[PDB]
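Annex B.
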Amino acid sequence: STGSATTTPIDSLDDAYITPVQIGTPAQTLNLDFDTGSSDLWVFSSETTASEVDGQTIYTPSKSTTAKLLSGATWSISYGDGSSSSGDVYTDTVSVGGLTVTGQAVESAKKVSSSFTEDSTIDGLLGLAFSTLNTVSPTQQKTFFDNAKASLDSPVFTADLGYHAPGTYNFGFIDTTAYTGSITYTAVSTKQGFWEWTSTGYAVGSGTFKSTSIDGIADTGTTLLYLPATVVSAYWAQVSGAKSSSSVGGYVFPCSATLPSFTFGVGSARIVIPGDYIDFGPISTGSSSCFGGIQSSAGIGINIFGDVALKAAFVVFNGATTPTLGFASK
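Endothiapepsin: predicted structure tokens.
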């Protein structure tokens, strides 16, 4: 079996992407944030504190003839940005782009943090990291991809995120018309539960390539690219007027600037992030200071290849027995 679904930026900065998911019988379609950095499928629902819902589409398990409560199950999750949610659990039928899993754990939110409430375009998350991160207790639950893996023509999904444009998540096949050249594959460590790999280096603009190992995670659920302070400083040093601002929480730059590109290594291969992709716009409506899309990871604990990086490539999340990651230019 295979599945294929379009994913669409939620705003003009590509802060996140939403993908339509069918839950229950008859289908209830919700637009979820596919996150390779987490492993919970959770949705706004009929059980969510009413004050904390503001425009999202909710899932009503009582309207779904295939929904069954997972007795005793609960869940609570906190994300790297400080947001958080929690609630109880149903199993129900879930389909993505024609691909159907029966008995998927659909985690129903009783509580969401303000940031989720304030984002009326994201009805929940569908996590695609490794199931060892799933927060359901006392019985940990499997991700959508884990549940579907056996039935897929190939045990893989791919991420083809667009720059200011829709893109695609494919399950179970490689679309050889979606990229150029060849796919470079690279080793993955699952020991922290993430799609964790090691980039071979970077270059700034037309600068010479610097070979150095950069351990990090491929994470569709993070907007920006978070790298070590040395790398990030070398980049922003090439933008006149750029500076790191504690008040704003990161590197900012003159909105009048033309940004240089950033290249990251995948083995012997090279992925180029156009400079335009690093511009996340005024820090406030009307401001002439713009927020940078490459930021330091020194206050994270981990380097994050978020959408700023992943959307410059076609990305194969290979869930074979030995997981690997593959990157191609497009």
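Residues 175-330 form a domain with the Cathepsin D, subunit A; domain 1 fold (CATH 2.40.70.10). The chain has four helices and 24 strands. Further annotation is deferred to the next reporting cycle.
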